[PDB]
Task: structure prediction
Amino acid sequence: LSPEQLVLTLLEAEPPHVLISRPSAPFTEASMMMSLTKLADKELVHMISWAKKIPGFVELSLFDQVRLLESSWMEVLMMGLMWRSIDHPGKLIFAPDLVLDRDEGKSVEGILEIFDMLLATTSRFRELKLQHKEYLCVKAMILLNSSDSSRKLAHLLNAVTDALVWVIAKSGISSQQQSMRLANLLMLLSHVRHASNKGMEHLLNMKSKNVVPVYDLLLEMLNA
Amino acid sequence: LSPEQLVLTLLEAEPPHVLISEASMMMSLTKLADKELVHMISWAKKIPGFVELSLFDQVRLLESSWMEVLMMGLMWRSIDHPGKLIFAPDLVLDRDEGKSVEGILEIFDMLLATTSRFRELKLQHKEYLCVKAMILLNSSDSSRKLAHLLNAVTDALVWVIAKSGISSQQQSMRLANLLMLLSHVRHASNKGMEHLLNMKSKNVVPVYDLLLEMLNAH
Amino acid sequence: HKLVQLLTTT
Amino acid sequence: SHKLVQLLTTT
Ligand SMILES: N#C[C@@H](Cc1ccc(O)cc1)c1ccc(O)cc1
Ligand SMILES: N#C[C@@H](Cc1ccc(O)cc1)c1ccc(O)cc1
Result:
């Protein structure tokens, strides 16, 4: 309800980290693909629970809730990945025991490009010194901006935006610097989204090539 | 440059109005995009700093962003014309005309809806100038110059909004609302690019050399 | 189907 | 094509 209360609600709503183990053997195309898709499937379950904890979300049309999650899920996953990774330069921290290097991307054709984009965008957030409460708001904004229910959605997106504005203002920088910081953060939403688009394309191609396991929720979300 | 003087430079960089002079609709649109791309290159070179980027960086920004820049221009030309996409004075299309080619209605609906969001925010001309430049400069020594140029254009947008006299709170909200709308312009451009690539792979729409070059980058 | 289940009956 | 580079380098 207040911006502080919305931020504290988002903080509480944060998903637990999903635990996946590194394969015993050096990565193959199959084992890398299995690890990342199993993780994605488990994180999607937790994402749905998270979205339902965003104040207001459950009051949207079910069809709106579906469309937003279907639209945004890989962006939300990637924003989470970038945040997990921001304290570990050079690494993509997919999970505590799934810590991947630009070079381990070599195991799957075309995935090194995705890893490079994610590492680069993470580095932009690191240089901006992205803060935890900023991340919370931005991740919610990714979901809510991905698309009477239409009015309610505008209202919910404005509330989260207002929260980010409040978070930035608590930093005590000048009005002009607060505006520049908001703009610099939001201009990265298209870089995360680019990485999402390239990741989704890649995963669809992998599903074609018969390397994606039967994970029910993931396949549903991939297919749209 | 002061932000005011940067915005005036973007006003001065604006491309001329372009006229085209089923199969006919698609030919008109691809003819138009080719003509507009010629003027887009001119425009970019008039953005202070752009020509001092590496040629590689100049090329990659234009290759990355061109469809997004075309679509942002279309939305601006359409803002005061509800229900219509003002491609050109002699190419005014609606979603009924879009239905005539598979895949085009979806795109037109997206463009119309995003235009409608800009109309509701009452997007201002100088805001449009800054965001169109930002689209180009934020697209997927030279590195530092580019970051400086994007920061300069971002500063100019912040200044435009500051000049509206609305409250400080409302300035931050407005900035966020405008910037969030650009991932919608970019989605529309992803859908359009996909559609045009499919049209090219089928040889259904004509061979315009600059357009083909710019499509082939994708 | 699974998405709608998780949204509404969990 | 090299029309983009041609237009970037001429007026
Ligand atoms: N990068 C990446 C992952 C997606 C991903 C991103 C973030 C997560 O938290 C979990 C998974 C991927 C998987 C298969 C592909 O074919 C392409 C990309
Ligand atoms: N919409 C649209 C146009 C692109 C376009 C956009 C803005 C302009 O100012 C000029 C042209 C299109 C053309 C061919 C396709 O196969 C699909 C879409």
